[PDB]
Amino acid sequence: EVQLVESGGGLVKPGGSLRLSCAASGFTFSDYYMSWIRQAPGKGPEWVSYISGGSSFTNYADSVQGRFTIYRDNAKNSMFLRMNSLRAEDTAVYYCARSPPTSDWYDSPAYNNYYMDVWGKGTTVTVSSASTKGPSVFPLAPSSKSTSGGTAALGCLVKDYFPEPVTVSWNSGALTSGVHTFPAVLQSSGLYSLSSVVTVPSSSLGTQTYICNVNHKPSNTKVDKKVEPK
Amino acid sequence: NLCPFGEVFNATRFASVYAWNRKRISNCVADYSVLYNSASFSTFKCYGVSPTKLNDLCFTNVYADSFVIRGDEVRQIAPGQTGKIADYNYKLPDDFTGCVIAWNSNNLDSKVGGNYNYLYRLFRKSNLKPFERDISTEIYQAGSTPCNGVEGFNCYFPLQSYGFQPTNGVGYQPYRVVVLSFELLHAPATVC
Amino acid sequence: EIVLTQSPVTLSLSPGERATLSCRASQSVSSSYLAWYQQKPGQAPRLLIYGASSRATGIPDRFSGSGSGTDFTLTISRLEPEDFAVYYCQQYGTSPTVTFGQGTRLEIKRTVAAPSVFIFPPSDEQLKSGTASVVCLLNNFYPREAKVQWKVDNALQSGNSQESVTEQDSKDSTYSLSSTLTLSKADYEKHKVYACEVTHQGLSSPVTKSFNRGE
Ligand SMILES: *[C@@H]1O[C@H](CO[C@@H]2O[C@@H](C)[C@@H](O)[C@@H](O)[C@@H]2O)[C@@H](O)[C@H](O)[C@H]1NC(C)=O
């Protein structure tokens, strides 16, 4: 099967560097143009760079010129993006993607098929002055006055963490119905916050324990919070 | 019926010198005089045969290598030369029989902030043999400590960019280079 | 540089219906070198069509592309639930650089459904920490459009709240929304009534859910 796997993304301060890798398998790597394409949070894809199968031809988005270098290694079935002088607006998911080929040339200049027929999963790049920090987990207690028609809502506020992501489960996965874990939003402070809520039968509030399973790997922080009716 | 020299000379993109391009010229007739008069060339130096003398000759194959370098380095595209290019990127043999053409491409290969599309090899354990093409990217050991494929102190990525800007001097301006090489074999000659 | 304008921004349709997504170019696109991509949240885009009308390998026949020059269209003749996602067009003909459109989001249209509104005062622990987050929850509503307004003692708030919305629920095609009001502990203690007012098409009149500090 054709596959592309990216790695090397991370969090860095403005002015730092990263070394992105793209490992390919399932095709004759040497015959294919390879490209990096980034997708900023909330935006669509943006082309970043390409390199031809013979490495003869390279091009970059105007905004990364002189800070990113693309190269490849056909013997390792791999290609790379060396990122230096990173800026905050370089934050995005980075995908490596393959373009299909069209031969008296080592690397023919007549090539126009710059569309991407295969993509990797992507690797995340976050560039920010902010420091890693685990979240504070606070209860959103079920309220007997805020119970309607036999349904009570409860949840957890996961506040002031960086960077993304966090995982939130309910009852170690046993609880999935009626669970809404919201997208993280960036606060003025530069730190993320999100709530995870769930609706349940009020009839079970005193009979079924409910636990917020919050994991933040970037800080190796795991918190379990039991939401009590108060 | 006639050789498509335009494909090589008027190609919209050119290659990084470390990954220099080659095209094969086959089964056609080569007017090496209309070629001298195709445009204004910074350099049109032949080693072994003149253009008119070549118009009355026939070879098996004609290779057209093409790439980009900076002004002060065009000199190095000649037999017996030394320097970043000749040593590390593109090496012409001493017994070279061919031609070297070069022109100024600043108007096309520079950008205001710098054009970093074009790379050259900066480090190498040894010099290149003639017509060798090294597109490896092994970490280069510049000090006494081995690098173990890890980049770090005196452990360098071996490629480096030119960064062409329109306001540079001509010596640091981009030039497109086309080397024509002549192959004479014990097989039917097909380029005249 | 070629600019690709995709429209509409959000397209609401039901399964079985036909979807048409528009991609106009600021100048002619050479050789119809225009590709389309589908992307599902948290997933990489996948190619659907190249050369304006060529279907990529493995792509269902219900997806078809057409157009040329500056006028391109992606048609999904019979919508299946897996087709609801974001779609991008991408030019790659005789331009200095490849260019993408900003995407068209195709979402499931269903019957109107008013939100269930809940309000959560800050936890005691958080107040002890020096801040007060008040959460208003709109649960299981459609359409996504909703207006949430906070009032501290019958006094509209501004600038001190942030909203978040889930992806369309895969079972009932509804949305849920969190609105968080962030005050300081001091500001919180200075007032009594905290209210969330919700305006939504499924509501005859804006619903308010409130609480009194300290009850
Ligand atoms: C490169 O181009 C030069 C300029 O002529 C222009 O390009 C050619 C290909 C034609 O399209 C012509 O009508 C244009 O005005 C030529 O003078 C030159 O011969 C070309 N180089 C080669 C090797 O053919």
Structural overview:
The complex is a heterotrimer of chains A (230), B (192) and C (215). By secondary structure, chain A is mainly β. Chain A has strands at residues 3-7, 11-12, 18-25, 33-39, 45-51, 58-60, 68-73, 78-83, 92-99, 118-119, 123-127, 136-140, 147-148, 151-161, 167-170, 179-181, 185-186, 192-201, 211-216, 221-226. Chain A has two domains: 3-127, Sandwich (Immunoglobulin-like), CATH 2.60.40.10; 136-223, Immunoglobulin-like (Sandwich), CATH 2.60.40.10. Chain A is 0% helix and 47% strand. In chain A, the strands form four sheets. In chain A, strands 2, 4, 5, 6, 9, 10 and 11 form a seven-stranded mixed beta sheet that branches. With 192 residues, chain B is an alpha+beta fold. Helix content of chain B is 15%, strand content 24%. Chain C has two domains: 4-108, Immunoglobulins (Immunoglobulin-like, Sandwich), CATH 2.60.40.10; 116-212, Immunoglobulins (Immunoglobulin-like), CATH 2.60.40. Helices cover 5% and strands 48% of the residues of chain C. Chain C is built from two helices and 18 strands. In chain C, strands 2, 4, 5, 6, 9, 10 and 11 form a seven-stranded mixed beta sheet that branches. In chain C, strand 17 and strand 18 form a beta hairpin. At the A-C interface, strand 5, strand 10, strand 12, strand 14 and strand 18 of A face strand 5, strand 9, strand 10, strand 12 and helix 1 of C. Bound molecules: a molecule of 2 linked components (NAG-FUC). A molecule of 2 linked components (NAG-FUC) binds next to helix 1 of chain B. Chain B: Disulfide bonds join 3-28, 46-99, 58-192, 147-155. Chain B: Residues 1-192 are annotated as: Receptor-binding domain (RBD). Chain B: Residues 104-175 are annotated as: Receptor-binding motif. Chain B: Residues 115-123 are annotated as: Immunodominant HLA epitope recognized by the CD8+. Chain B: Glycans are attached at residue 10.
Shape of chain B: globular
Q: Which structural category do the helix and sheet elements of chain B fall into?
A: alpha+beta
Task: Please report the distance between the alpha carbons of the first and last residues of chain B.
Answer: 11 Å
The biggest beta sheet of chain C reads:
7 strands, mixed
Total E-strand runs of chain B: 9
The total beta strand count of chain C reads: 18
Strand content of chain B: 15-25%
CATH T-level fold name of the largest domain in chain C:
Immunoglobulin-like
Strand content of chain C: over 45%
* Ligand roster: a molecule of 2 linked components (NAG-FUC)
Overall shape of chain C: elongated
Helix and strand run of chain B: HEHEHEHHEHEEEEE
* Residues in helix, % of chain C: under 10%
What is the topology, as strand order, of the major beta sheet of chain B?
1-3-9-4-2
Oligomer: heterotrimer
The biggest beta sheet of chain B reads: 5 strands, antiparallel
Could you say which structural class the secondary elements and strand pairing of chain C correspond to? mainly beta
Query: Over all CA atoms, what is the radius of gyration of chain B?
Result: 18 Å
Distance between the termini of chain C: 61 Å
**What is the annotated CATH architecture of the largest domain in chain C?**
Sandwich
What is the alpha-carbon Rg of chain C in Å? 23 Å
Region (Disordered) (chain B): 122-157
Glycosylation sites (chain B): 10
Region (Integrin-binding motif) (chain B): 70-72
Region (Receptor-binding motif) (chain B): 104-175
